[PDB]
Paper text:
The resolution of our maps in this region was ~9 Å which is sufficient to identify them as belonging to the IC-LC tower based on its crystal structure. In each IC-LC tower, LC8 binds to the dynein heavy chain-1 (A1/B1) while TCTEX1 binds to the dynein heavy chain-2 (A2/B2). Firstly, the interaction with the DHCs reinforces the dynein tails lying parallel to one another. The IC-LC towers are docked beneath the DHCs of both dynein-A and dynein-B. As the two differ in motor-conformation and binding to LIS1, it suggests neither factor affects the IC-LC interaction. In our structure the LC8 interaction is the same whereas the additional TCTEX1 interaction is only possible because of the parallel arrangement of the DHC. The IC-LC tower positioning, however, means they are constrained close to the dynein-B motor domain and the p150-CC1A.
Cytoplasmic dynein is a microtubule motor vital for cellular organization and division. It functions as a ~4 MDa complex containing its cofactor dynactin and a cargo-specific coiled-coil adaptor.
Residue numbers in the entry:
A (entry chain E), B (entry chain D): 1 to 89
C (entry chain G): 1163 to 1347
D (entry chain J), E (entry chain I): 110 to 140
F (entry chain A): 1115 to 1162
G (entry chain L), H (entry chain K): 1 to 113
Write the structure that this text describes.
Amino acid sequence: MCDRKAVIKNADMSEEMQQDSVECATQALEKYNIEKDIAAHIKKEFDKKYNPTWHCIVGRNFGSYVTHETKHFIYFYLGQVAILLFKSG
Amino acid sequence: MCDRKAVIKNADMSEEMQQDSVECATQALEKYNIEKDIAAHIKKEFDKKYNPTWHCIVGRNFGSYVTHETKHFIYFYLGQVAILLFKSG
Amino acid sequence: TSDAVTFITYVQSLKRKIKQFEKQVELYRNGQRLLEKQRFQFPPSWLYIDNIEGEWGAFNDIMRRKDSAIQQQVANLQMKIVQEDRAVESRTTDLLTDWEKTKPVTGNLRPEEALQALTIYEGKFGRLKDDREKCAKAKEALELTDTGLLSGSEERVQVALEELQDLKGVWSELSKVWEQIDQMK
Amino acid sequence: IKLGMAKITQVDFPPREIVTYTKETQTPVMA
Amino acid sequence: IKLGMAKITQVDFPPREIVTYTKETQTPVMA
Amino acid sequence: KVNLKYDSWHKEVLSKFGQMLGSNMTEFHSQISKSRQELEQHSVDTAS
Amino acid sequence: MEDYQAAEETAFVVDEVSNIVKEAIESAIGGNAYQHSKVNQWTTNVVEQTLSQLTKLGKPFKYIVTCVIMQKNGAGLHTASSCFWDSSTDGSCTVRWENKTMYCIVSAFGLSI
Amino acid sequence: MEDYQAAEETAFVVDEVSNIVKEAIESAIGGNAYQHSKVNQWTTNVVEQTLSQLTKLGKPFKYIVTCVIMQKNGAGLHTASSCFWDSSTDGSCTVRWENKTMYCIVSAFGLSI
C-alpha cells in the first residue's frame, strides 16, 4: 500500500460517515479495478449501513451535477481516482 | 457531435424522450465544452420538462452503480463523451 | 411568527455579512492555490477551499431556498401581522380601560396593595408591550415596515406606561406621606 | 325514513412505487 | 329546524421534502 | 495502558449508564403501559 | 303528475353535486403546486364553496362535505365512506381529482330530513 | 334519574363514537405495518365496525363514517370537514391516529331524524 491520501473536494456529511466513505472507497479500490465494481461496493455497503437510496460514481474523468439530501454528499479523491457519492431516492 | 455516432448502451426510457436525451446532450456539447456545464444544462432542461429529480454524469472516463426510476434511464456515448441520464428522488 | 422573525433577522444579519463572507472565500481561494503554487503539503485536518466552497455553495443554496420560503411565508406571516396587530389593539384597549378605571389614585388607601396593583398593571402592560414589540419586530424583519407600522396601540400602551410612571411616582410620594400617616395615627 | 346500510364507497390511490432498478455502467477505459 | 353552518374540522400532519441541494463536480485536467 | 484501561473505563461508565437508563426505561414502560391500560379499560362513558 | 316533479325537486342527483365539486376544486386549487400552508385554505375554500353552492339549490337536505388534499410523494392513499341513511332519498358523491403535484379527494353527502 | 340518561340516549353524544372508533381501529389495523393489500380491508373494517356499534346504541340518527389511512413516507396529512346540520342536535367526531408506519384519520357524524 502506497499512501493513498484522501483529499475531500466537497463535504455535506457527518465526519463519521466521511471517514467511513474514505475507508469504504479504500476497500473498494483495493478489491476492484473496474470503477463500476468500486461503485458497487460503496453503494451496497452504504445502502446496508445508511439506508436506500445512495448513488455512487467512480472514475478519473467526469463532470457532473448531483441532487442530494442534507448531510448526504461527498465528492472526494483517492489518489487520482475520484469518488462521487450522494443519496437520492 | 462530428462523426461521434450516438449509440445507446442501455435504455429504460421512451424513444421520443430518449431522442430528447440525444438532442439535449448534442446541443449541450454544442454550447459548452466543460462537462459540468453540459450536466447543469441537461439538469435544467430535464428538470423543467420531465420534472425533479434527474441526475446526470457527463464525462469520458467513469464507472457507476446507480439507481434509476423505471422509464427514466439512458447510458449513451456521444463518441468519447458518455452521458448517463437517470432520475431518482 | 416571532421566532421565525428572529431567524429572518439572523438571515439578514448574515446578508449584511455576506460581502465579508464572499471576500473571505476569495482570500482563502487566493491563499489556497498560492500554497498549491508554492507547494505546501496540506494536512487532511485542513479543510480546503474545496470544502469551504462546498459549505459556501451549500450556504448559498440554503439561503436561496429559505429566501423562497420567506417569499411564500409573506402571506401567512402578513395575515399573522394583521391578527397580532389587531390583537395588540384589542388587548391594548381592554387593558387601557382596566388600567384607567381600576387603578388606585387617591389618598385614602394603604399604599402597599395600591403599588401592588400598579405593578400588576405594569407587568401586564410589560407583557402587552412585549406582544407589541414582537409584532413590531415582525413588521421590521418581514418588510411590512412603514415607520415600523407603529400602531395606535403602541402609543396607547406607552402613554398608559407614562401615566403609570406618573401614578407610581405620586403613589411613591404618597407612600412617604402614608408612612408619615402611620407615624401620626 | 327507512334507515339502511349504504354502499362502501372506496377511493384507492395506490403508492405508485418503482421497484427501483440499479444498473452498472462503465466508460470502456479508452486510451 | 334552523339549519346552519358547522365548523371546519381540520387535522394537519406536516410533510417534508427531504432537503435537496444541487452541487456540481468536475474532475480536473491535471498538470 | 492508559488508552486500553481508559477504553475499559469508558466501557464501564457506558455500561452502567446503559443499566441505569434501562432500569429507568423499564420502570417508565411499566407505569406508562399500566396507565394507558387503565385508560383502555376505564371508559369515561360509564353510567355512574 | 306533480308528485314526480316534487320527487325530482328533493332528489340527490350525484352529477350536479359532482359538478359543484369540480367548480369548487377548480375555483380554489386551480393547477398550482403543493404548498402545505395553502393546503389549509384550499381545503377550507373547497368545503366552503361546496357548502355555498349546495345550499343555493333550495333542496331539503343536510349536507356533509369532507375533503382530502395530498402531495404526490409515492405514498399510499385509501379513503372509504359507507354511511347509514334512508336509501330512497339520500345519496353521496366522491370525486377523485389530481394534477401534477397533488391528489384531491372530495366526499360530498346529502341526507334528507 | 331517568330523563338525564334519556337525554344521553337522544342527543349526539360526540365521543362515545370515539370509543367505537378506537375499538374499530384497534380491532382492524392493530400494530401491523403498511402493506397496501390490507389497507382496503383495514378501511372497510374500521368503517363497518363503526357502523356496527353506532347502530347498537339505539339512537335515532343518520350516521356517516369516513376514514383516511396514510402511509408514512414523508407525505403529510391534511383533511377538513365543515357541514350543514341543525346545531343543537348534531355534531362531529374526528379522531387522528398513527403508529411508526401508518397514519389514520376517522371522521364520524350523526344526523338526527
